[PDB]
Amino acid sequence: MTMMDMNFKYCHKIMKKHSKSFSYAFDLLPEDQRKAVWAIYAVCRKIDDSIDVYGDIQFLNQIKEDIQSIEKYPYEYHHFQSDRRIMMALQHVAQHKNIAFQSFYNLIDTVYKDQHFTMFETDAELFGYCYGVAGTVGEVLTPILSDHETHQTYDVARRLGESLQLINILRDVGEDFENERIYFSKQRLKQYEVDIAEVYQNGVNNHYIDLWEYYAAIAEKDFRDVMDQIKVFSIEAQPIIELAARIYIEILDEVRQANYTLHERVFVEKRKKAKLFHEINSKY
Protein backbone atom coordinates (compact mmCIF):
# COMPACT_ATOMS: atom_id res chain seq x y z
CA MET A 1 0.00 0.00 0.00
CA THR A 2 1.84 3.09 -1.37
CA MET A 3 1.85 6.71 -0.12
CA MET A 4 -0.95 8.36 -1.94
CA ASP A 5 -2.93 5.21 -1.08
CA MET A 6 -2.51 6.14 2.60
CA ASN A 7 -3.93 9.65 1.96
CA PHE A 8 -6.98 8.47 0.02
CA LYS A 9 -7.71 6.17 2.91
CA TYR A 10 -7.89 9.04 5.44
CA CYS A 11 -10.11 10.74 2.90
CA HIS A 12 -12.13 7.59 2.59
CA LYS A 13 -12.38 7.19 6.39
CA ILE A 14 -13.68 10.76 6.72
CA MET A 15 -16.38 10.24 4.05
CA LYS A 16 -17.46 6.95 5.53
CA LYS A 17 -17.63 8.62 8.86
CA HIS A 18 -19.85 11.51 7.94
CA SER A 19 -22.32 10.11 5.40
CA LYS A 20 -22.98 6.36 5.40
CA SER A 21 -25.20 6.72 2.32
CA PHE A 22 -22.77 8.45 0.06
CA SER A 23 -20.08 5.98 0.96
CA TYR A 24 -22.37 2.95 0.57
CA ALA A 25 -22.96 4.14 -2.95
CA PHE A 26 -19.81 5.78 -4.27
CA ASP A 27 -17.65 2.96 -2.92
CA LEU A 28 -19.14 0.84 -5.69
CA LEU A 29 -17.37 2.99 -8.28
CA PRO A 30 -14.21 1.90 -10.10
CA GLU A 31 -10.89 2.48 -8.29
CA ASP A 32 -9.87 5.59 -10.26
CA GLN A 33 -13.13 7.39 -9.80
CA ARG A 34 -14.03 6.58 -6.24
CA LYS A 35 -10.65 7.76 -4.98
CA ALA A 36 -11.13 11.11 -6.67
CA VAL A 37 -14.59 11.30 -5.21
CA TRP A 38 -13.07 10.50 -1.77
CA ALA A 39 -10.56 13.35 -2.11
CA ILE A 40 -13.24 15.91 -2.97
CA TYR A 41 -15.69 14.91 -0.29
CA ALA A 42 -12.98 15.05 2.37
CA VAL A 43 -11.82 18.52 1.28
CA CYS A 44 -15.38 19.66 1.54
CA ARG A 45 -15.95 17.89 4.82
CA LYS A 46 -13.03 19.83 6.20
CA ILE A 47 -14.38 23.08 4.83
CA ASP A 48 -17.61 22.62 6.81
CA ASP A 49 -15.83 21.55 10.04
CA SER A 50 -13.08 24.21 9.90
CA ILE A 51 -15.27 26.44 12.06
CA ASP A 52 -15.56 24.24 15.16
CA VAL A 53 -11.75 24.24 15.68
CA TYR A 54 -10.55 27.26 17.78
CA GLY A 55 -13.90 29.10 17.44
CA ASP A 56 -12.54 31.31 14.68
CA ILE A 57 -11.68 31.14 11.03
CA GLN A 58 -7.99 30.50 10.75
CA PHE A 59 -7.94 27.15 9.03
CA LEU A 60 -10.64 28.03 6.60
CA ASN A 61 -8.20 30.38 5.00
CA GLN A 62 -5.47 27.92 5.16
CA ILE A 63 -7.71 25.42 3.39
CA LYS A 64 -8.56 28.21 0.94
CA GLU A 65 -4.80 28.86 0.74
CA ASP A 66 -3.80 25.19 0.15
CA ILE A 67 -6.52 25.02 -2.54
CA GLN A 68 -5.54 28.27 -4.18
CA SER A 69 -1.98 26.85 -4.15
CA ILE A 70 -2.97 23.67 -6.02
CA GLU A 71 -5.02 25.71 -8.33
CA LYS A 72 -2.02 27.66 -9.34
CA TYR A 73 0.95 25.33 -9.29
CA PRO A 74 -0.40 21.80 -9.40
CA TYR A 75 2.98 20.19 -10.22
CA GLU A 76 5.13 21.81 -7.56
CA TYR A 77 5.32 20.46 -3.99
CA HIS A 78 3.51 22.50 -1.30
CA HIS A 79 3.85 22.52 2.50
CA PHE A 80 0.12 22.61 3.22
CA GLN A 81 -0.91 24.79 6.20
CA SER A 82 -4.08 22.77 6.93
CA ASP A 83 -4.51 19.06 6.34
CA ARG A 84 -1.86 17.47 4.27
CA ARG A 85 -3.27 14.05 3.93
CA ILE A 86 -6.20 15.58 2.11
CA MET A 87 -4.60 18.41 0.14
CA MET A 88 -2.29 15.78 -1.33
CA ALA A 89 -5.06 13.49 -2.60
CA LEU A 90 -6.73 16.51 -4.13
CA GLN A 91 -3.52 17.61 -5.80
CA HIS A 92 -3.21 14.09 -7.26
CA VAL A 93 -6.76 14.29 -8.59
CA ALA A 94 -6.16 17.77 -9.93
CA GLN A 95 -3.35 16.41 -12.04
CA HIS A 96 -5.44 13.77 -13.86
CA LYS A 97 -8.81 15.65 -13.77
CA ASN A 98 -10.49 19.05 -14.30
CA ILE A 99 -11.51 20.79 -11.10
CA ALA A 100 -14.15 23.51 -10.76
CA PHE A 101 -11.95 25.42 -8.24
CA GLN A 102 -14.40 28.29 -8.27
CA SER A 103 -17.09 26.06 -6.81
CA PHE A 104 -14.79 25.26 -3.85
CA TYR A 105 -14.54 28.95 -3.25
CA ASN A 106 -18.28 29.34 -3.63
CA LEU A 107 -18.58 26.74 -0.88
CA ILE A 108 -15.97 28.41 1.27
CA ASP A 109 -17.68 31.76 0.81
CA THR A 110 -20.88 30.08 1.86
CA VAL A 111 -19.22 28.87 5.07
CA TYR A 112 -17.52 32.22 5.94
CA LYS A 113 -21.01 33.60 5.36
CA ASP A 114 -22.78 31.20 7.63
CA GLN A 115 -21.09 32.52 10.74
CA HIS A 116 -23.59 35.44 10.71
CA PHE A 117 -26.56 33.18 9.91
CA THR A 118 -29.81 35.06 9.95
CA MET A 119 -32.92 33.15 8.92
CA PHE A 120 -33.99 33.25 5.28
CA GLU A 121 -36.52 35.89 4.16
CA THR A 122 -37.77 33.83 1.28
CA ASP A 123 -37.24 30.36 -0.21
CA ALA A 124 -34.93 32.08 -2.70
CA GLU A 125 -32.36 32.62 0.08
CA LEU A 126 -32.87 29.00 1.11
CA PHE A 127 -32.34 27.70 -2.39
CA GLY A 128 -29.29 29.98 -2.68
CA TYR A 129 -27.81 28.38 0.39
CA CYS A 130 -28.38 24.83 -0.96
CA TYR A 131 -26.49 25.84 -4.00
CA GLY A 132 -23.59 27.13 -1.98
CA VAL A 133 -23.31 24.11 0.27
CA ALA A 134 -24.15 21.34 -2.18
CA GLY A 135 -24.82 22.55 -5.73
CA THR A 136 -21.11 23.40 -5.64
CA VAL A 137 -20.20 19.86 -4.56
CA GLY A 138 -22.15 18.44 -7.49
CA GLU A 139 -20.29 20.66 -9.93
CA VAL A 140 -16.86 19.68 -8.60
CA LEU A 141 -17.92 16.04 -8.91
CA THR A 142 -19.08 16.45 -12.51
CA PRO A 143 -15.78 15.87 -14.47
CA ILE A 144 -15.41 12.76 -12.27
CA LEU A 145 -18.74 11.12 -13.12
CA SER A 146 -19.13 11.79 -16.83
CA ASP A 147 -17.01 11.36 -19.92
CA HIS A 148 -17.77 14.63 -21.69
CA GLU A 149 -18.94 17.33 -19.30
CA THR A 150 -21.27 19.78 -21.00
CA HIS A 151 -23.22 22.69 -19.45
CA GLN A 152 -25.90 20.08 -19.30
CA THR A 153 -23.99 17.68 -17.07
CA TYR A 154 -23.13 20.44 -14.64
CA ASP A 155 -26.70 21.59 -14.46
CA VAL A 156 -28.12 18.15 -13.52
CA ALA A 157 -25.35 17.42 -10.97
CA ARG A 158 -25.89 20.79 -9.24
CA ARG A 159 -29.61 20.17 -9.20
CA LEU A 160 -29.01 16.77 -7.59
CA GLY A 161 -26.69 18.32 -5.03
CA GLU A 162 -29.24 20.96 -4.15
CA SER A 163 -32.00 18.35 -3.74
CA LEU A 164 -30.10 16.14 -1.37
CA GLN A 165 -29.24 19.13 0.77
CA LEU A 166 -32.85 20.05 0.84
CA ILE A 167 -33.63 16.53 2.08
CA ASN A 168 -30.93 16.53 4.64
CA ILE A 169 -32.47 19.82 5.92
CA LEU A 170 -35.86 18.17 5.96
CA ARG A 171 -34.47 15.34 7.99
CA ASP A 172 -32.65 17.41 10.54
CA VAL A 173 -35.38 19.83 11.49
CA GLY A 174 -35.17 19.12 15.25
CA GLU A 175 -31.37 18.76 15.48
CA ASP A 176 -30.90 22.02 13.51
CA PHE A 177 -33.33 23.76 15.87
CA GLU A 178 -31.29 22.67 18.90
CA ASN A 179 -28.24 24.45 17.47
CA GLU A 180 -30.33 27.61 16.95
CA ARG A 181 -30.72 27.16 13.23
CA ILE A 182 -33.91 27.04 11.20
CA TYR A 183 -33.73 26.64 7.46
CA PHE A 184 -37.38 27.06 6.40
CA SER A 185 -37.96 30.59 5.08
CA LYS A 186 -39.55 33.31 7.21
CA GLN A 187 -41.88 33.78 4.27
CA ARG A 188 -42.94 30.17 4.05
CA LEU A 189 -43.33 29.96 7.81
CA LYS A 190 -45.68 32.92 8.15
CA GLN A 191 -47.74 31.67 5.22
CA TYR A 192 -48.07 28.29 6.90
CA GLU A 193 -48.48 29.61 10.45
CA VAL A 194 -45.64 27.58 11.96
CA ASP A 195 -43.32 28.50 14.78
CA ILE A 196 -40.63 25.85 15.06
CA ALA A 197 -39.92 26.42 18.78
CA GLU A 198 -43.60 25.70 19.47
CA VAL A 199 -43.59 22.48 17.45
CA TYR A 200 -40.42 21.37 19.15
CA GLN A 201 -42.11 21.54 22.56
CA ASN A 202 -45.65 20.52 21.67
CA GLY A 203 -45.10 17.90 18.93
CA VAL A 204 -46.16 18.13 15.30
CA ASN A 205 -49.50 19.53 14.13
CA ASN A 206 -51.19 19.87 10.68
CA HIS A 207 -49.47 23.10 9.66
CA TYR A 208 -46.00 21.65 10.14
CA ILE A 209 -46.87 18.53 8.17
CA ASP A 210 -48.02 20.80 5.33
CA LEU A 211 -45.01 23.10 5.26
CA TRP A 212 -42.77 20.10 5.42
CA GLU A 213 -44.65 18.38 2.64
CA TYR A 214 -44.56 21.51 0.58
CA TYR A 215 -40.74 21.26 0.66
CA ALA A 216 -40.83 17.45 0.38
CA ALA A 217 -42.67 17.95 -2.89
CA ILE A 218 -39.98 20.27 -4.29
CA ALA A 219 -37.28 17.74 -3.63
CA GLU A 220 -39.26 14.72 -4.87
CA LYS A 221 -39.95 16.57 -8.12
CA ASP A 222 -36.39 17.66 -8.60
CA PHE A 223 -35.19 14.10 -8.01
CA ARG A 224 -37.53 12.94 -10.79
CA ASP A 225 -36.03 15.57 -13.13
CA VAL A 226 -32.52 14.33 -12.42
CA MET A 227 -33.47 10.67 -12.86
CA ASP A 228 -34.71 11.48 -16.34
CA GLN A 229 -31.38 12.94 -17.32
CA ILE A 230 -29.21 10.40 -15.51
CA LYS A 231 -27.79 9.55 -18.93
CA VAL A 232 -25.49 12.62 -18.89
CA PHE A 233 -23.30 10.68 -16.52
CA SER A 234 -20.83 8.02 -17.66
CA ILE A 235 -22.18 4.46 -17.81
CA GLU A 236 -20.41 3.20 -14.64
CA ALA A 237 -21.61 6.20 -12.63
CA GLN A 238 -25.31 5.95 -13.55
CA PRO A 239 -26.52 3.17 -11.25
CA ILE A 240 -24.29 4.55 -8.44
CA ILE A 241 -25.80 8.01 -8.81
CA GLU A 242 -29.25 6.54 -9.00
CA LEU A 243 -28.44 4.62 -5.87
CA ALA A 244 -27.34 7.64 -3.78
CA ALA A 245 -30.46 9.42 -4.98
CA ARG A 246 -32.79 6.57 -4.17
CA ILE A 247 -31.35 6.18 -0.71
CA TYR A 248 -31.75 9.89 -0.07
CA ILE A 249 -35.35 10.09 -1.32
CA GLU A 250 -35.98 7.09 0.87
CA ILE A 251 -35.07 9.32 3.79
CA LEU A 252 -38.35 11.17 3.26
CA ASP A 253 -40.60 8.14 3.81
CA GLU A 254 -38.57 7.67 6.96
CA VAL A 255 -39.33 11.16 8.29
CA ARG A 256 -42.97 10.39 7.38
CA GLN A 257 -43.02 7.03 9.22
CA ALA A 258 -41.44 8.70 12.27
CA ASN A 259 -44.35 11.22 12.20
CA TYR A 260 -41.95 14.04 11.39
CA THR A 261 -40.27 13.84 14.82
CA LEU A 262 -38.14 16.74 15.90
CA HIS A 263 -36.31 14.80 18.65
CA GLU A 264 -34.09 12.56 16.57
CA ARG A 265 -32.39 11.66 13.34
CA VAL A 266 -34.15 9.12 11.17
CA PHE A 267 -32.04 6.82 8.98
CA VAL A 268 -32.32 4.25 6.23
CA GLU A 269 -31.33 0.74 7.40
CA LYS A 270 -28.26 -0.76 5.68
CA ARG A 271 -30.48 -3.69 4.66
CA LYS A 272 -33.01 -1.39 2.96
CA LYS A 273 -30.03 0.27 1.21
CA ALA A 274 -29.05 -3.15 -0.23
CA LYS A 275 -32.64 -3.89 -1.09
CA LEU A 276 -32.65 -0.66 -3.16
CA PHE A 277 -29.26 -1.37 -4.71
CA HIS A 278 -30.68 -4.70 -5.75
CA GLU A 279 -33.73 -3.17 -7.42
CA ILE A 280 -31.56 -0.64 -9.30
CA ASN A 281 -28.68 -3.08 -9.93
CA SER A 282 -31.27 -5.56 -11.28
CA LYS A 283 -32.47 -3.05 -13.92
CA TYR A 284 -28.87 -2.51 -15.33
Ligand SMILES: CCCCCCCCOc1cccc(CSc2ccc(Br)cc2C(=O)O)c1
Ligand atom coordinates in the same frame (compact mmCIF):
# COMPACT_ATOMS: atom_id res chain seq x y z
C1 LIG B 1 -23.53 13.98 -7.90
C2 LIG B 1 -24.31 14.34 -6.66
C3 LIG B 1 -23.51 15.27 -5.80
C4 LIG B 1 -23.91 15.13 -4.35
C5 LIG B 1 -23.42 16.32 -3.53
C6 LIG B 1 -23.43 16.01 -2.04
C7 LIG B 1 -24.31 16.98 -1.30
C8 LIG B 1 -23.47 17.80 -0.37
O1 LIG B 1 -22.41 16.94 -0.20
C9 LIG B 1 -21.48 17.43 0.63
C10 LIG B 1 -20.35 16.69 0.83
C11 LIG B 1 -19.38 17.17 1.65
C12 LIG B 1 -19.53 18.38 2.27
C13 LIG B 1 -20.65 19.12 2.07
C14 LIG B 1 -20.81 20.44 2.78
S1 LIG B 1 -21.96 20.09 4.14
C15 LIG B 1 -22.22 21.64 4.82
C16 LIG B 1 -21.52 22.68 4.26
C17 LIG B 1 -21.67 23.96 4.74
C18 LIG B 1 -22.52 24.20 5.80
BR1 LIG B 1 -22.65 25.95 6.41
C19 LIG B 1 -23.22 23.16 6.38
C20 LIG B 1 -23.08 21.88 5.88
C21 LIG B 1 -23.89 20.79 6.56
O2 LIG B 1 -24.11 19.71 5.97
O3 LIG B 1 -24.29 21.06 7.71
C22 LIG B 1 -21.64 18.64 1.25
Ligand SMILES: [Mg+2]
Ligand atom coordinates in the same frame (compact mmCIF):
# COMPACT_ATOMS: atom_id res chain seq x y z
MG1 LIG C 1 -27.70 20.01 8.15
